[PDB]
Amino acid sequence: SPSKAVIVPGNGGGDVTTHGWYGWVKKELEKIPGFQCLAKNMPDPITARESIWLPFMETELHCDEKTIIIGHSSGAIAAMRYAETHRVYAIVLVSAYTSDLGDENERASGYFTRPWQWEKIKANCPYIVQFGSTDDPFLPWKEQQEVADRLETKLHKFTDCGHFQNTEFHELITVVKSLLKVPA
């Protein structure tokens, strides 16, 4: 049974408490009595190196078999790579993709150096929800669709959310509360 949520943000130097919807989602989830949504500024925030983010997820964010991991952009990539070798209660991917997009800073992360272990992810995480938008200025839909197909995600496909940089995200709250089994 899930005990907490963790937000792994996108790359970049924005404070996790105010960038996009992270702080709003944390505050909304923590309205549930006793429920923690961990969201911390990441080490190596610009390059988002796998060798730094994945240990941080294990040691400092305590991501385990009772954790719902909410990963956005680089954090979605990290959550997928994390789940190749870690049991995770559930993963909500926001703006997920599969390759370095030809960008050197994506490449520098190290997430895109070897094949995706899709079957291992699915065995380690039976509950994978995905948000994506066809007007994402950074991601081609093909890459978001590849994630949805390879991981058999519950796909919430939008047309007008871009890279999900807005400040509120009620659809995500509903998803997370469903995963927590909060009754209506």
Residue numbers in the entry: 3 to 186
Which passages does the manuscript contain on this structure?
To address this problem, we investigated a cross-seeding approach with a mixture integrating a heterogeneous set of protein crystal fragments to be used as generic seeds. The fragments are nanometre-sized templates chosen to promote crystal nucleation of protein samples unrelated to the proteins forming the seeds. To demonstrate applicability, the generic cross-seeding mixture was simply added to a sample of the human retinoblastoma binding protein 9 (RBBP9) before proceeding with crystallization.
An atypical crystal form of the human serine hydrolase retinoblastoma binding protein 9 was obtained by adding the mixture to the protein sample before performing standard crystallization assays. The structure was solved by X-ray crystallography at 1.4 Å resolution. Follow-up experiments showed that crystal fragments of α-amylase were critical components in this particular result. A different crystal morphology was only observed when the seeding mixture was added to the sample in two screening conditions: MORPHEUS-FUSION D5 {12.5% w/v PEG 1000, 12.5% w/v PEG 3350, 12.5% v/v MPD [(RS)-2-methyl-2,4-pentanediol], 0.1 M MOPS/HEPES-Na [4-(2-hydroxyethyl)piperazine-1-ethanesulfonic acid], sodium salt pH 7.5, 20 mM amino acids, 20 mM monosaccharides} and F8 {12.5% w/v PEG 1000, 12.5% w/v PEG 3350, 12.5% v/v MPD, 0.1 M MES [2-(N-morpholino)ethanesulfonic acid]/imidazole pH 6.5, 1 mM alkalis, 0.5% w/v cryo-polyols}. These crystals were single and not elongated [Fig. 3(b)]. However, no unexplained electron density was found that would indicate a cross-seeding fragment caused specific interactions leading to switch the crystal form. However, we could not produce a model describing the possible mechanisms of cross-seeding that could have directly promoted the different crystal form of RBBP9 (space group P212121) with α-amylase fragments, for example by comparing their lattices. In fact, other speculations could be based on indirect effects of the seeds instead of cross-seeding. For example, α-amylase fragments could act as purifying agents, by mobilizing poorly folded RBBP9 molecules, which enabled the growth of a different crystal form.
